DNA sequence: TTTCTAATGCGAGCATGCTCGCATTAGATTTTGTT
């Protein structure tokens, strides 16, 4: 056997520090280590790993790799391999296993699942196959639903609370009998009765309990259709690990190193599932590393209770270790990075510090202004320089106000912002003129496609167009007659009238009516094809509208011959859709329109490039990405603390009591002693509950501030667009202002003092008004008289003719 | 060896390619035309080798060339001197066996169907492997796993309830019944061709050993290298070895040996058939399937080689991501019940209403839009409109019983074209009735003529017509079925030259010159996968089949083993005689290589190509126009893609010149609507034409979704209200509400009560505000000029108008909204505006007033302040501003706080 | 033509200081996951 300094030299590696020592020169068992934020994660992991292969405890094929994402588990994945491969030159078969948890979960179910009653060829859904489901079962449910409130909005709330009952196993069950206690209190300064306020807390509880058969209803649907959703698959995998040890013994034996990597972004259905397999009180022999970062939480606390809860089997606890050393400036990770201190790092490649710049400005428009001309002013130094190219990006916390963000870059800089799949003007015009073919009274649809750039029409057109469509309708008060319009069946005034049947030619512009013919003509051709499949249909239309050619006419140069991914995407999604259950034409647009609702349309192509673009991506996303200097643009009173949207256990229907959430991470209100006294009582837990949204919003500022590879440009605006009172700047700020004065390491910058405000619009003229000119004159002129072009040409053309 | 008069028993054995299944066929050809068997392995190799045979030789007769099973049951057959029904079997086995009180621990999984696969796999593979029910009760019994000889005696009590995979397991037996049935086939047959002996199962191997015991010849032919699907080749008898490919390239089969070094593994590839290998990469999952459908397209156009000799061999079809993308860049790709066919579906539904005698509405919409007479829905709305003409209702009658009405009997109002579309119906329906005494459909078919238009569709939707006259030839043969086996028919229906791709193990019957093994990747083609279960079916199979593992459930529930895996990749390269291609994707963000790639990329003739080029003519178009208008790159190249765009549109190839580009279309007219003028502006319209004229246009004239159910509910609520004593108007609406539609019955009571209360509340306010203003009219409309030199002449119909305690007009109008507006927007609404102007210049009788604007739901009204000369005259220039707004080309498209629900949104370039 | 929930500043109700309905206005937080 080697110790880690030699294996690591007999390689061609660095020797790994003393923190990268205690680590994989650790016995064999269960132990966590804490990794802080830019560690190097995801490298120690390979070390472990090659450790124990090469010391020979355990051969490649016992190794097991569970990492929360798939693109992490597929970074660690490759250095697993690298290195394993790598190892067998310096003193084979097979190799690795990797998997996201839910997948992990997925193939425990399909290899141990009739031990429980549940099916191995059960469907997953995604969230809009769901939802599309879920608001069946709750028209379709016989009753009252005392609620007030319209369906498609109780779909929501059935919805997040089968999502979090799937999530904390409590099987619906049990959540009944919370209301009583609460209810029998209340009822029994001035002598009103009970105040009004409270009233309404208690009409939630029993508005829970009265969805609690539309909850359960819901699972037996999905059981009779053998489809199950990500919730309740993770939920049975934990039920069936803890239920059964044959399971664990099965594999405990097949798996000997087990590598639990994001072990700090994981709730109370995988704590459970994952404990209870190996960790419980199993042998010490088993490895069982796990990595988490406790200040670092975005997505929602296992990590304090790692410790007790995979033991040595003889009732002591397992070991802790720490990686410090983040390989990040000293400004950003001394003094910054401790904004959250609330433990209860240092400078790596002792590297050249960095500037630290922060700013109250009086507008949006000026701190935009400002980050934009930084910006700027760094990306044109680095042409200066001869191509530095400092590729940075600016964390914005909205998803929304980063769009004009590229309008405030496009003018020096050059943005990427990294719409969804149904908003790409390549897609869309697919999708409107699917509608106009499937159903007429689309006017939405129609304006699309008369108002697109395939032809332009005219305002006396378009008028002309309404006109003969209002006078081609020719329908003439009582009860029975307004009832009577507005069923399935009743006719109306719609445009896609006039298309077909124009009239006479004068009224329409001569150049208007040739178009107006081409187009009847078009749908006159396409609207045969409701008989195909749909998947043969959609490539028809796609075939009749020129998309496929110009998607690629409009596209630099740099780009080899890309274009048309997210056509074929989509197409991919519609030949997934059909063939299931009903080819269903006019049921797509259902399945469109209710996947643009919820999940903001689809996922796109996500095309990479590698020019020095300045990212505007989201702060709540791109975590483990450290690249460039980095800046967050507002931290104002409300965008970023965001502690607006904080509906409690007591006020929305939708979320679990802390007396029976599993977690129990909160306050569980315990109310045991006795009405002014309880009115105190719950603005107190509240409040309490409160923090803890406070408390998750230094995790995504310390994620934002730890992403600062080079240099900050942290900022605060003031007086925010379409308002009438300052907001002025937010916590986060103050005290990052305090926090920044008392050191070397930040610079103040125009700390606008505290104050009318902006009233200025946005237009742009309708009908529109250059390379394009030129070319098109050019290929003209060579009409009138490498890469292997004419090969090409002269091979399509043999085919022609045939 | 081999040769007439020779030994009772020889063996034959060769690498892939070689000529050992046409080999045997010279030997037979020579050789009574009886006396000769020939046992393949498939029906599908039984055409191609009784093919050759037969055309290899008036009175010639064919020798009996067939299968294993076929002659196992043929021997059953002499002996006499489905999996559907099967699994049917077992769940009412479980089903029963779960009455009385298996190991119990899985007693809950006996009602699924995933204990009934697994089971059926388990039974499946002892029948196969040849173990006695009873010698597994003694496995069971010996082995202490319960699971196994509880199945063991659910196997006996199985084999109890009998006396297709069990005829060679009956067959054993069979011969050994007479003991002297052996002996007229041992004299009756003399050849006995059984080839393909890797593929051979243990049971049947032993009907080939006593069919071999001796007589005459018998020829065991087949590579014992490639047996993944275990032979047992090793004798003393002759052997003959065969040593070249004549399929295989010696480039190919250089990769090929060297694969198989690391597992007679020697062979060596045709010397004249000079090819390659070429392993190849992507960068995403779509760059793969574009640059297989770039590599075959080239192959086909300039290399020659036609379809038909291409192939993709993946791993197995779950796969279904290629065929799409393959097939979009134009190469023809080879390869849902009858039920589900709209052809077929529709003439059964006319099967089904003339069976019953009695047609509903809502059955024979669903016919006008089907093939029989087919009907689009802007022709549907020709219908609908042309038959309301026929009677004319003040309430309009249901398109359900119009269409039924005159299809039974037609009205003749309109009857321009709609004549014909009706009587396709009319004879459909009507000669279905004719015979009312099968021949019925038949008659029902002939009636329509889609037939004589299916089969004029042969050209181009051609492909539409092929389908078509499938599923209705489907549906015959299915009718025939009955026939020889109409209300019970419905319910009893109710239950060439092309890149072939395919998986691997379909896959070894391929004699293609260029095969591209897709889906390489590492999870994938290694399996992974564990082979597991509940029943230990996978650790039992090699316990049972030989000693491959001793007794311990250890090894065989991990994942299939490579050296069972890497002989996969070995026969199907072997497959490929000219040119082969491995491709597998790696892409930075979900994807690698598998341990296979590298190592083939030893033996290989030759950054992964991230957008790779394509040979199609919507591609090849698309790329030349992307350069000619770029900014600046390829400076002569430019004119090169100029001149060849010249070329491409000088024949065809929609898309080059630039008449058919997009942004060189011109607009038709840029000329005002009304250049000439009086523009009449109702009091709604100028509230969205002072906020987005843009919207304005596109919304008012054509762009609205089109009359949502909260609209008309407000207006009959208004239509109520308006009419002149709450109690009489709940039930005036309580007797119309139910033909509203709403998704949700239970929300239907919900709306009912809330407007009721509305109403309710609407009383309450209406007698609480007598007290000081006094209703001259109600609905009374406005119309008349306001403002004029363009003037606007304000015409709309207002909601209530009220005369004021001192000498004065306060006009109000009812909402039906929850949510009120600001107590400042509602000073300048717009619409209320308008009102007080209306009422200033007459045209009602008169001075401004108030505006009220109550709110019935929740009641809470904010008015507003009544209008001064200093105020009303900005008031008209607001509006002479807007009427000018309305006239130009160019309209401004302004934002604004209800720009997140205008239904022109998806148009609009503010956005 | 149309809206959820809540935080705000009153403003009478009664043991000057709260105190609690009552009416009026601002915003609609972000994605991770199967074959
Ligand atoms: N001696 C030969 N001369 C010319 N052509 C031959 C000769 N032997 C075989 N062939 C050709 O090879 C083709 C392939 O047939 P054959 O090789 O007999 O199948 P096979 O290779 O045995 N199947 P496999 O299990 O993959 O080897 C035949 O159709 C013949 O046309
Ligand atoms: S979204 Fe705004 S700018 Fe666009 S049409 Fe609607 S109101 Fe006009
Ligand atoms: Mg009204």
């Known amino acids: 056997r080697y110790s880690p300094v030699e294996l690591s030299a007999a390689l061609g590696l660095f020797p790994p520090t003393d923190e990268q020592a205690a680590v994989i020169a650790a016995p064999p068992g269960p132990l966590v280590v804490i990794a802080g934020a830019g560690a190097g994660k995801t490298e120690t992991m390979a070390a472990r790993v090659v450790w124990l292969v090469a010391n020979g405890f355990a051969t490649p094929s016992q190794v097991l790799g569970l990492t929360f994402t798939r693109k992490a588990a597929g970074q660690l994945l490759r250095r697993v391999r690298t290195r394993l491969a790598r190892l067998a030159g310096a003193g084979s078969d097979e190799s690795a296993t990797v998997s996201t948890y839910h997948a992990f979960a997925g193939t425990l179910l399909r290899e141990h699942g009739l031990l429980l009653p549940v099916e191995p060829d059960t469907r997953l859904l995604s969230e809009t196959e769901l939802w599309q489901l879920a608001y069946d079962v709750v028209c379709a449910h016989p009753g009252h639903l005392d609620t007030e409130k319209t369906p498609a909005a109780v779909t929501a709330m059935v919805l997040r609370l089968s999502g979090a009952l799937a999530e904390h196993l409590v099987d619906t069950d049990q959540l009944r009998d919370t209301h009583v206690e609460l209810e029998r209190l209340v009822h029994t300064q001035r002598d009103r009765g009970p105040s009004q306020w409270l009233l309404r807390m208690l009409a939630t509880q029993t508005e829970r309990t009265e969805l609690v058969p539309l909850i359960d209803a819901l699972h037996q649907r999905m059981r009779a259709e053998k489809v199950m959703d990500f919730g309740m698959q993770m939920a049975a995998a934990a039920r069936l690990a803890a239920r059964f040890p044959q399971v664990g013994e099965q594999l405990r034996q097949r798996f000997r190193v087990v590598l639990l990597d994001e072990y700090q972004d994981t709730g109370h259905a995988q704590r459970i599932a994952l404990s209870s397999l190996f960790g419980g009180g199993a042998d010490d022999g088993l490895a069982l590393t796990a990595v988490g970062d406790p200040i670092q939480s975005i997505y929602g606390t296992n990590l304090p209770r790692f410790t007790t809860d995979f033991p040595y089997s003889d009732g002591t606890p397992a070991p802790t270790l720490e990686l410090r050393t983040s390989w990040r400036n000293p400004p950003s990770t001394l003094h910054v990075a401790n904004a959250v201190s609330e433990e209860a790092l240092r400078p790596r490649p002792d590297a050249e510090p960095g500037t630290i710049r922060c700013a109250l400005l009086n507008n949006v428009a000026a701190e935009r202004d400002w980050v934009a001309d930084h910006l700027a002013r760094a990306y044109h130094g680095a042409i200066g320089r001869g191509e530095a190219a400092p590729t940075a990006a600016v964390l914005v916390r909205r998803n929304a106000d980063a769009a004009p963000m590229a309008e405030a870059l496009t003018a020096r800089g050059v943005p990427v912002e990294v719409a969804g799949l149904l908003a790409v003007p390549e897609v869309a015009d697919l999708v409107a003129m699917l509608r106009l073919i499937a159903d007429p009274t689309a006017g939405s649809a129609v304006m699309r496609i008369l108002t697109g750039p395939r032809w332009r029409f005219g305002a006396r057109d378009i008028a002309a167009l309404w006109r003969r469509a209002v006078e081609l309708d020719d329908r003439p008060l009582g009860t029975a007659d307004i009832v009577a319009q507005a069923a399935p069946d009743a006719d109306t005034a719609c445009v896609a009238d006039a298309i077909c049947d124009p009239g006479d030619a004068e009224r329409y512009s001569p150049a208007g009516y040739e178009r107006i013919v081409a187009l009847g003509r078009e749908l006159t051709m396409l609207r045969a094809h409701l008989g195909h499949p749909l998947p043969e249909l959609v490539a028809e239309v796609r075939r009749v509208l020129g998309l496929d050619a110009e998607a690629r006419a409009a596209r630099p140069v740099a780009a080899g011959w890309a274009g048309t991914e997210n056509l074929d995407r989509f197409s991919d999604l519609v030949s997934d859709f059909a063939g299931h259950a009903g080819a269903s034409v006019s049921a797509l647009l259902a399945y469109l329109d209710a996947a643009v609702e919820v999940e903001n349309g689809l996922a796109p192509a996500e095309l990479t490039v590698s020019h020095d673009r300045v990212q505007i991506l989201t702060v709540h996303a791109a975590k483990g990405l450290e690249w460039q200097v980095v800046a967050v643009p507002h931290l104002s009173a409300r965008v970023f603390p965001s502690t607006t949207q904080a509906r409690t256990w007591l006020t929305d229907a939708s979320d679990l009591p802390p007396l029976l959430r599993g977690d129990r991470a909160t306050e569980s209100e315990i109310g045991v002693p006795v009405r002014k006294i309880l009115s105190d009582k719950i603005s107190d837990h509240k409040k309490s509950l409160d923090q803890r949204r406070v408390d998750e919003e230094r995790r995504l500022l310390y994620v934002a501030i730890t992403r600062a590879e080079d240099t900050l440009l942290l900022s605060g605006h003031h007086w925010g667009a379409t308002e009438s009172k300052p907001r002025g700047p937010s916590e986060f700020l103050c005290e990052l202002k305090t926090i920044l004065e008392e050191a070397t390491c930040g610079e103040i910058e125009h700390w606008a003092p505290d104050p009318p405000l902006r009233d200025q619009v946005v237009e742009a003229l309708w009908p529109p008004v250059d390379h394009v000119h030129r070319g098109a004159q050019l290929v003209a002129a060579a009409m009138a008289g490498q890469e292997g072009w004419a090969a090409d040409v002269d091979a399509l053309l043999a085919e022609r003719e045939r | ?911």
């Open chain 2, 1 to 911: 060896l081999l040769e007439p008069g020779s030994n009772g028993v020889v063996r034959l054995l060769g690498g892939p390619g070689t000529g050992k299944s046409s080999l045997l066929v010279d030997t037979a050809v020579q050789h009574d035309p009886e006396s000769v068997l020939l046992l393949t392995g498939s029906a599908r190799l039984r055409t191609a080798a009784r093919a050759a045979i037969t055309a290899r030789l008036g009175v010639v007769r064919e020798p009996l060339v067939r299968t294993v099973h076929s002659y196992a049951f043929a021997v059953l057959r002499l002996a006499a001197q489905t999996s559907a029904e099967q699994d049917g079997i077992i769940r009412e086995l479980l089903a029963g066996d779960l009455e009385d009180g298996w190991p119990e621990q899985l007693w809950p999984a006996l009602t699924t169907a995933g204990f009934a696969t697994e089971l059926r796999d388990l039974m499946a593979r002892c029948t196969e492997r040849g173990v006695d029910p009873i010698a597994l009760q003694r496995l069971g019994r010996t082995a202490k796993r319960p699971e196994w000889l509880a199945a063991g005696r659910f196997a006996q009590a199985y084999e109890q309830i009998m006396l297709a995979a069990e005829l060679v397991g009956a067959a054993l037996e069979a011969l050994g019944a007479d003991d002297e049935l052996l002996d007229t086939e041992r004299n009756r047959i003399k050849l006995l061709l059984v080839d393909d002996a890797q593929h051979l199962d243990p049971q049947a191997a032993r009907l080939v050993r006593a069919l071999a015991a001796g007589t005459g010849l018998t020829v065991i032919a087949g590579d014992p290298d490639q047996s993944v699907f275990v032979l047992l080749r090793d004798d003393t008898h002759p052997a003959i070895t065969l040593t070249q490919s004549y399929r295989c390239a010696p480039e190919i089969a250089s990769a090929i040996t060297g694969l198989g070094q690391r597992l007679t593994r020697h062979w060596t590839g045709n010397p004249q058939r000079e090819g390659t290998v070429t392993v190849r990469l992507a960068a995403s999952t779509h760059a793969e399937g574009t640059m297989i459908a770039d590599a075959l397209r080239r192959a086909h156009l300039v290399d020659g080689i036609p379809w038909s000799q291409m192939a993709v061999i993946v791993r197995s079809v779950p796969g279904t991501a290629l065929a799409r993308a393959l097939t979009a860049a134009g190469v023809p790709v080879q390869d849902v019940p009858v039920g589900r066919q709209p052809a077929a579906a529709a003439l059964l539904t006319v099967l089904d209403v003339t069976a019953t005698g009695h047609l509903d509405a809502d059955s024979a919409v669903a016919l006008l839009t089907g093939p029989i007479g087919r009907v689009d829905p802007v022709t549907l709305r020709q219908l609908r409109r042309a038959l309301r003409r026929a009677d004319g209702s003040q309430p309009p009658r249901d398109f359900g019983d119009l269409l039924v009405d005159a299809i039974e009997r037609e009205p003749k109002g309109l009857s321009a074209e709609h004549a014909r579309t009706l009587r396709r119906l009319r004879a459909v329906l009507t000669a279905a009735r004719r015979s009312d005494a099968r021949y019925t459909l038949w008659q029902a078919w002939h009636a329509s003529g889609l037939q004589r238009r299916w089969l004029a569709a042969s050209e181009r939707v051609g492909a539409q017509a092929d389908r078509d006259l499938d599923a209705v030839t489907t549906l015959f043969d299915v009718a025939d079925q009955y026939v020889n086996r109409l209300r019970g028919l419905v319910d009893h229906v109710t239950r060439a030259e092309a890149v072939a791709v395919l998986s691997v193990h379909g896959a070894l019957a391929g004699e293609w010159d260029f095969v591209v093994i897709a889906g390489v990747q590492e999870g994938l083609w290694p399996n992974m996968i564990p082979r597991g279960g509940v029943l230990g079916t996978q650790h039992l199979v090699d316990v049972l089949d030989g000693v491959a593992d001793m007794t311990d459930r250890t090894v065989s529930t991990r994942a299939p083993l490579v050296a069972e895996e890497r002989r996969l990749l070995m026969a199907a390269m072997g497959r490929a005689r000219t040119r082969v291609m491995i491709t597998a994707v790696d892409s930075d963000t979900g994807l690698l290589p598998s341990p296979f790639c590298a190592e083939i990329s030893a033996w290989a003739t030759e950054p992964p190509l991230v957008a790779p080029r394509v040979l199609a003519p919507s591609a090849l178009v698309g790329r030349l126009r992307a350069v000619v208008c770029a900014p600046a790159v390829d400076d002569d190249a430019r004119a090169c893609a100029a001149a060849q765009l010249a070329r491409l549109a000088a024949a065809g190839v929609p898309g080059a010149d630039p008449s058919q580009w997009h942004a060189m279309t011109s607009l038709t007219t840029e000329e005002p609507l009304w250049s000439e003028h009086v523009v009449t502006l109702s009091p709604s319209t100028l509230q969205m034409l002072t906020d987005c004229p843009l919207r304005w246009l596109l919304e008012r004239h054509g762009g609205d979704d089109g009359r949502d159910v909260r609209s008309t509910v407000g207006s009959l609520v208004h239509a109520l209200v308006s009419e002149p004593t709450e109690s009489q108007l709940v039930n005036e609406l309580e007797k119309v509400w139910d033909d509203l539609p709403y998704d949700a019955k239970w929300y239907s009571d919900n709306e009912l009560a809330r407007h009721r209360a509305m109403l309710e509340t609407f009383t309450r306010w209406r007698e609480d505000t007598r007290r000081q203003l006094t209703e001259v009219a109600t609905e009374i409309p406005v119309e008349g000029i306001v403002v004029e030199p363009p003037g606007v002449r304000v015409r709309g119909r207002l909601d209530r108008l009220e005369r004021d305690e001192a000498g004065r007009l306060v006009v109000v109008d009812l909402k039906t909204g929850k949510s009120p507006v600001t107590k400042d927007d509602a000073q300048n609404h717009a619409q209320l505006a308008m009102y007080q102007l209306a009422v200033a210049a007459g045209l009602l009788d008169d001075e401004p007033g108030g505006g009220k604007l109550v709110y019935l739901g929740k009641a809470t009204e904010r008015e507003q302040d009544p209008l001064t000369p200093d105020k009303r005259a900005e008031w008209l220039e607001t509006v002479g501003e807007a009427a000018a707004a309305t006239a130009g080309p160019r309209f401004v498209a302004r934002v604004n706080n209800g720009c997140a629900n205008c239904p022109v949104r998806s148009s609009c370039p503010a956005q």
